[PDB]
């Protein structure tokens, strides 16, 4: 039973391979910031030996009250990824929202992304299916792990067969999330063993990020999705919860030590 | 403490007023069917004395595998509502999906509708806000009742202040819904006491529809959302669960008897 | 399909019969208080026309920190029910905790009660099964409605076949309860259609008691379990949440109006 | 911030120390079996270098229908632990149910245990508090992690201050459990940093045991609770789900490799 491999350029994402890191920032506030964030990951990844795919949103549909920061915009966001690609030579992953945006971004970036709230959006999926580019389906909090087959299927049909599934926790009562460590296996299985990744920062709507991401890794995953900010405190708002840049390295040492140890175990069968 | 009133033509929707009924069908399969469904409600409502606003989807973004029935289409769906308006003189409520569709439908229909998965879609909301038409915000299953203030707010700003909130249950573990009868009050409160309605058929992903809709009514609501089909059995699929047409009347007698009794109680205060 | 009838003296408890009321207080603080509480129910029930079975605990195993009020005690509690029976001629329902207590109480009272935390206590059940007295099984918050067959079964075997099932809500995330209005039918069914009752005050760990108990009634139940206190505010602590005595009557008028209306509907079948 | 240490003889249980293993069987079917089970753990623990405390129930209050296997009995169960202590020189942990049983067992065993359903049983706690023996409080599935302070408190008062807290998952909808990997920290904190252990087999009401117990370990725990049976298949019933004896070793190598790696990390602070 081999794992499906979805490659992003010279990067091979798979459940038995060493974990990739889809780190980055939440939104593209400014390049002076993006560049600084994207500067620390690369340096750290490169130094520690972990594949990496910078991530950032050039748009926001989940903000509150219209008189707010939408984001750079598709036309001004794409321009920012360009400069980063050249200056750093790393892959870019971003999310989309409308069926049209799909192709534009596909050119500019390596791994596009389907938001949870839109996971069941046939039109936007088919249109994202066209591009042929790699896809990251974030798993809605209101959907059980064993249903991710339909989304992978609807994508195959669209002609696209390069998909990663991302988990960000499940609804646990009112206003709360809990990550079921058992849904990872369920997702691998119903997905033709497609790559599964953990979005730790989303799963935490704290000093908790670490303990949770260790757990996630010990299960054995293809990747790890995360976000960080130079100054979480003052720039704190809502949505996710970023990691403190200055802690990137000592945190990622934890992951590798886990991901390497685990990715190298003699297959076990508690089944019988 | 008076209830906000949102009127749909000669219809006044409010939490203390007699409940309106936003009945209808799921999708617009064919007019030969729509007409027959819409024919039984009217006859029954008119005979029993309950306000009514036919409902039906001219589109479907929540189906499975692209090679499926999208639906009539916006351009061919609107045409169907026309004929119904004339032939029956009843109001039409439909849902939308993309920011552009908003205005077109606003002309053709009385009460437009914001789908749950898109509830937090600022662009589609602002664009739905423009129309100025009445709005029905379906409450996502993954959002607590006390958060419906933000959606009502984002609509006020868009200039729209004629909104109804619709409840369809909350996530209870994997693949299941439970309706919290207490979230109705919480929603009234944080919504400037906007009209609250219960989508019983959605809340049931059975011979259960009745007991659940009675409960809902006994709490005291502005309205009741429902769907029915001539032959539920054979045409059974998934998504919601329709009511059997031939049972519309004896079922709605239950509601009125409840809605009237309750809507006429001396305000009680178990508070102290 | 007739409902099983479990009679408590001249009282017949059943799902199609008019609802009984198992009202009362939480603990037996003092007779000067018990008597006053038990005095208002009787007067109100008798005046409104609702069967009634005073309820009160002579013991508490769910308190916090040992240096606390256990309660009157089994030997001094039973004595209190005596005086009430004579002075008022109403039935008494109390809960037990240890296998021995069963018989003693059975003599003194009409309806004994099995606590939730002990619902799965075979020894205490078998011993409660001996008495032959009526039983009220409170449904644990951590057990689904369709599992209440085993408890009813284990009681049949113990020779006891006079059981009522009481619902008090289900766990919804951390520290919260939600009442699934659909579990009532599920419980009737798997219980040989035994009597089902709603413990509204427990289901609320407020000015909410009313809306929730209406919902419960509109479903159609055998009974209603409740608690009240002269002064909820100052004597507020935790565990349940009592109703304000002075509101007993106007509240119970709501129930009857509901329970009577509903208990007299032409059987409906939304099934087909 | 040092961790509280609760020693069981020459064994020191603590959150920063290497994890102990409270393995064993579910019930004491027969000594010919107990001995064989207890024979494989010891051999494996001793060989791999992991502290160990055999565990087994001499009683069962959670079975179905009275005409069933209660268990050896307190008087005949204690006798079985004796023989094992001598023949193997390992500590025994068992659970109790009634206030009286407490002392008897305290003599015979090292670590007694408080069942979940009885966690809030003041009398049985105070009586278990007397013994002065080590205690293992299983965390009810219907209680949030931050409430385990009250149980630890009620025990301090009883004079007992040697307590371990055991986690077995939380209710997630109807008939299901999910382990919140974040509740471990919450429990340490509110417990004066008492030892926290994971009951993996209970948390699974499969070939899943492994992935879940890895996750648990990667968080960093004092211990690991488990059960196994020579032939899970044929002897399968319900309640927990045992591990296959023949897989004990290759499974426990996973844990140590995790528990050692993690227990030796430079304290991290994602907090700031």
JSON list of C-alpha atoms in Angstrom, two decimals, chain C residues 7-8 32 57 85 88 107 258:
[
{"chain": "C", "resi": 7, "resn": "UNK", "atom": "CA", "xyz": [-49.49, 3.86, 37.38]},
{"chain": "C", "resi": 8, "resn": "UNK", "atom": "CA", "xyz": [-48.41, 5.56, 40.61]},
{"chain": "C", "resi": 32, "resn": "UNK", "atom": "CA", "xyz": [-40.64, 24.71, 56.96]},
{"chain": "C", "resi": 57, "resn": "UNK", "atom": "CA", "xyz": [-33.80, 14.84, 47.49]},
{"chain": "C", "resi": 85, "resn": "UNK", "atom": "CA", "xyz": [-48.20, 12.69, 52.67]},
{"chain": "C", "resi": 88, "resn": "UNK", "atom": "CA", "xyz": [-51.32, 17.01, 51.72]},
{"chain": "C", "resi": 107, "resn": "UNK", "atom": "CA", "xyz": [-42.10, 1.88, 51.69]},
{"chain": "C", "resi": 258, "resn": "UNK", "atom": "CA", "xyz": [-49.95, 22.88, 24.99]}
]
